[PDB]
Amino acid sequence: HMVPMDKTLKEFGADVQWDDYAQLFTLIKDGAYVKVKPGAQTAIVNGQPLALQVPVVMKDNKAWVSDTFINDVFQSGLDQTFQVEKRPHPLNALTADEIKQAVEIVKASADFKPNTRFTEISLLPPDKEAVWAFALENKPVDQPRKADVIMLDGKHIIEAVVDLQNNKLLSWQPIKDAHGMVLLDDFASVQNIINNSEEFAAAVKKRGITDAKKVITTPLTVGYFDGKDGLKQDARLLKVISYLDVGDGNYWAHPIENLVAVVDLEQKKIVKIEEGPVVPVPMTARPFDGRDRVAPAVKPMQIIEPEGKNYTITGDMIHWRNWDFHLSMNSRVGPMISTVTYNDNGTKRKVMYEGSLGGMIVPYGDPDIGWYFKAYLDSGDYGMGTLTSPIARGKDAPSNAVLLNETIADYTGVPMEIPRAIAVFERYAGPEYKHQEMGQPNVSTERRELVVRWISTVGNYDYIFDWIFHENGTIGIDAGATGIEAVKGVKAKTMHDETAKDDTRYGTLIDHNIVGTTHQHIYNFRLDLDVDGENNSLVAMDPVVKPNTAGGPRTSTMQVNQYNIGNEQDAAQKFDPGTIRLLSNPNKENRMGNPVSYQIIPYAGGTHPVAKGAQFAPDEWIYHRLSFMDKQLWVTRYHPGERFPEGKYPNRSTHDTGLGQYSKDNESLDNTDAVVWMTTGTTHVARAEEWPIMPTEWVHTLLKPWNFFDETPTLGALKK
Amino acid sequence: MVPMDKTLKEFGADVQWDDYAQLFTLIKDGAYVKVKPGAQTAIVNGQPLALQVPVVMKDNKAWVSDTFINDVFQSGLDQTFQVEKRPHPLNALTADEIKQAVEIVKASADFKPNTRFTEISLLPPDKEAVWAFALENKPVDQPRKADVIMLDGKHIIEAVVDLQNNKLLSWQPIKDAHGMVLLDDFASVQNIINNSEEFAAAVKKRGITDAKKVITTPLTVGYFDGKDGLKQDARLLKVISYLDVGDGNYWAHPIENLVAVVDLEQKKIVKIEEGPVVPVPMTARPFDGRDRVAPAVKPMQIIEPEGKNYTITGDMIHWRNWDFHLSMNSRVGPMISTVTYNDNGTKRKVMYEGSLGGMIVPYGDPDIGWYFKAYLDSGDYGMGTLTSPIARGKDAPSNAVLLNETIADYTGVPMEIPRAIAVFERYAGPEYKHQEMGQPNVSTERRELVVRWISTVGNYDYIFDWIFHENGTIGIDAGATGIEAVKGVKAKTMHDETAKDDTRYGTLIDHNIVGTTHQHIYNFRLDLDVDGENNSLVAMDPVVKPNTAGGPRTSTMQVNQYNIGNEQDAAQKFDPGTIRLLSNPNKENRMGNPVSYQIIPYAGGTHPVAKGAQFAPDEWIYHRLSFMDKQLWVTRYHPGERFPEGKYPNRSTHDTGLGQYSKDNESLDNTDAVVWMTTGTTHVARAEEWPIMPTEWVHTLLKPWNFFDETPTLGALK
Ligand SMILES: [Cu+2]
Ligand SMILES: [Cu+2]
Ligand code: NA
Ligand code: NA
Ligand code: NA
Ligand code: NA
């Protein structure tokens, strides 16, 4: 007995092409490329024949398949993209069971309270060295699996550790002063409290709003202002910004400007209602979903790899040409790329022990009541792994991508499987190199890049991250920003209205009554690079114009200043893209006697204006609290507990406990295990082109092998 | 009948047989063909075709009718290309016009016997007439004319010919100009060297046993007000030499400190400069794979089975909301013209003409073989002429369409460059996305249309991409690859004694081989008519100001806005932190903002960036070529001002380029402007780039700025 091919396969998630002339189906899904003919005894999977007991049936222009077709074909094994792991890698994430076990163990302390929530539950990372010894030497790591369990007990943070090998609780530790991040149920609470507010309904009615049920709230954190905002330092507070729902699916386009509510999550009450001038809510419909648009014709374009992929995913290990690395997922920072090696003619050479997003911030520049505190720390305050956006197959990533699911703990400590959470795809990136000697045959090779892509969405913005592995050893990291703008409601319809000048002082007027408030997007990446080992030094090479001292007619020459950067404080610096910064290994040279190095480029371009530093006066708290914002390059001594640019508990923090703290003591960076931090940002002055939805804007960073090799890396196997 | 594989392949098509489906798939440029043995029909870009003669399987190989290729591919079901019934006025000189123009000047009595041709080009009709053609379809009422530039021995002469009336309109000798380097100069240089006792002798010194294995390379000598000891009115080239050792890579075998100066009119060496003998590096370093085995890769194809979304009509290209015209020039290569954006039914002007303006690759080493070294690749060598045919599938994706283009060689004969330019669409990530919490997703694909051109001059190969975004943005990227100019040195590793002196001016990248430091400086000439030609240049500098409106913030994010009124102020360093707009102060979007385009001379690069010329302001090259040391320029539209480095930059004594064009500091207020973007890299070498350099890219960008009233990709309203 059977079932409709077309519909089952759509559920399952495969693309389905019918070719009437060839009488042939082409089915695609991840590493599987399938061709089958109605009534044929065999199908084709990645070039390999597969026997069907029950062939595909055409019945009045309708295709029908056996109820096991989908397993028989895709589960077949002829799609070799995924292989199962012999020995579980030591950096594999907590599995659902492990998550479930950690939650039971802490629930069995006498201190657990049922209102408790989990801010993060994550592998406590074994020690770098055993991990490397596992990757390179296969030495089993013999210290036992532990998980970090970070709980929010009302407003207090407790950090618990559990040992899962032995099912026991190793530590339980309240963290004084620390506030927890925003959690999912906070969103509901806030909407709820506003809903139950007689007072709030009144503030709202007198700003033109007749149906309060129509008000969409959104929770922001309050930052820290040494009291100027009038808020007690030791309460769990969030500010609530409001929109009117008009039925166009875009409440973001209907700001109720100049109304703020401060909510005490513990009490579950609005403890304050800041109120300013009444600005009429912008009411014109502004859907971004296409509802009011003509869908034009597009000729199809497909990228296909009909014999399967060049990469192999074994458990979480990915192998691709000379690259090997381990890919996993954290609830706070998303993807983590670990134990990365480059296979040099047989021997795997170390490149990066662990790279991931460090943290990010999007701080605005308008002083008015609904804005002066607006600064999202997306990962740290909202948990970016958790808010991963499933990839939209074929659109969010190219049609030849393979899409992975990933499993993290949610806030109540139940596992959640994120479908299509990270995309992996190879892409053609132009010619790897070329020379066309005059009169001679041409020489050209293709360039191929392996991209790992992850998208996370926080309130209005959507961020995309690409980790790009060039065959020739380069590694790129790019962040793209898209979504909907945080807009300010204003009286001016055009720049000709009386108030336009005042309305547009902190942002562009991007639609009638709507201003795109200026702000920055500052990303930072924590790269624990071990260039061919962990003992590294940071080197500077500054191209300079020196006077010619060798005679002949030139007055000047191009020369370099090479010097070492001996310690943390000197390493925290602006990046001038005119200069070269290497992380060299001073114990290891290439065939020419040069320290094998990677070149570190925090700014390799972008589509928005670039952020030169924090767009804040040096006396702003946000400035005081987050130094990572103002240097492009930082290097610190390896420290397992040092992970976040913004610091570990940044909600309403009062000092810098991130990169400022990590480099406070100004330690030696000479010939020692370093961690690199790249900060890169844009400064976003808006324009109509970005409204009601912003075209994706991109920044790029780059890491390039610098005399890490002896020659053109992609020349090929030597046959002599 | 004729054999299917041999015919299709001679034709340039890609043949795939699929035994499972018993199906052939044939691909070439815009045609995607599906045909089965014995079928009465085929599919061409999704559409059915009756076959005169079915395809026959005769012994596991296939036969087709002798007409098949034409029947099928030129059937009209592949619509990539349509006929141009009314020729765009900027259409390049055809082969016939080239021959006609050569005859006309060959018929003057002033035409001297061995005269050569530096450049034979359309003399474009005037701007307004051409816009009128493209927008209103007005016939341009002007005979087709050509600029004919001649090199008589060493003398430059500009002629203009009227091709319609077949008459010579003018014949101007050009006082003091030197001609660019022409093909046949390469061989003279080589012969002249081969026949020089003196040189054969200088070479034997340096340890070379057979002088017929010595490969010459011709360089322009610059200008040093006599310090180089070279007389000004003589036609000269300096020769650097290498030793051919059979590895196919003479560049890897320099003869250091040996320079010859050749006078091309006398045909002889007029000076040999000789410095310390450095043994020639000998090790075979081929780069063509002769000694390598690529590893086996699974196939990847990018397919457009229903044909392309663009349409090429003669040289006009239509694609989504873009329309524009693509022609080819022997000097600067491709030119993009009469570019408009169809805004909901109305074509709005964006760029009249954009093209490479000029480039330069200047070196940082004072020694005898280098101090003068500086390739002005287009202006001194002719980058169009030296176009490198695109290698299908490799230099461009497997879904490109490859164009042929015609120009005149230095003897005046037409020359068809096969696959001179690639046109291709590509997925470029999501165009926009919002995943609202708890809601259905919204995503659209970004597509870009790319125009790719590759030129190779001596050892560099350069790639240019003109990239049209659906959303109205235009990127322009320049890629650099090929083989480094290296210096022979005694040092083998950084441990040897000479190593430090040896690397004062570059990295030791192989034994005895140093990659001399230099820069790559590209300049793009962009006549933009933002929604019309009457424009002004506007600065917007984001700044941090004190909060005045109250509350806890001490500071705010504000913008300094102001007009840049005149050419000298427009001539400026670019701060990627600031914004620069070419605005149309006469037209505004729905919000009352002037429609504009944001200009981004530096949107990134994979090599370190040059923020200016790496030359003391008193170096002659710095003086001759101002364009190197500012990233943005804007000048008043003038039809004769096209080259940032000047019309005749060979051995020039002043700046006839952008230095001269802004010499008089004219007004840029509400008038026709021409934007010039300079971007460049500072190249410090590494071993990863030897013997062949992985392509490195720089990026620039032109973005609509309040040109539209909203997200331009949303689609039309119902
Ligand atoms: Cu933004
Ligand atoms: Cu270079
Ligand atoms: Na490290
Ligand atoms: Na430290
Ligand atoms: Na113009
Ligand atoms: Na001028």
Curated annotation (Swiss-Prot), chain A:
Mn(2+) binds at D528, D530, D673. The modification 2',4',5'-topaquinone is found at Y461. It comes from the Bacteria. Ca(2+) 2 binds at E568, Y662, D665, E667, A674. Keywords: Calcium, Copper, Manganese, Metal-binding, Oxidoreductase, Periplasm, Signal, TPQ. Ca(2+) 1 binds at D528, L529, D530, D673, A674. Substrate binds at residues 376-387, 458-463. Its EC number is 1.4.3.21. It is an enzyme of class 1 (oxidoreductase). It holds the Pfam family Cu_amine_oxidN2. Its cofactor is Cu cation; Zn(2+); Ca(2+); L-topaquinone. Cu cation binds at H519, H521, H684. Coiled coil: none annotated. GO terms for biological process: amine metabolic process; L-phenylalanine catabolic process; phenylethylamine catabolic process. Homodimer. Belongs to the copper/topaquinone oxidase family. NCBIfam families: PRK14696.1 (NF011285). The enzyme prefers aromatic over aliphatic amines. This is Primary amine oxidase. The gene is tynA.
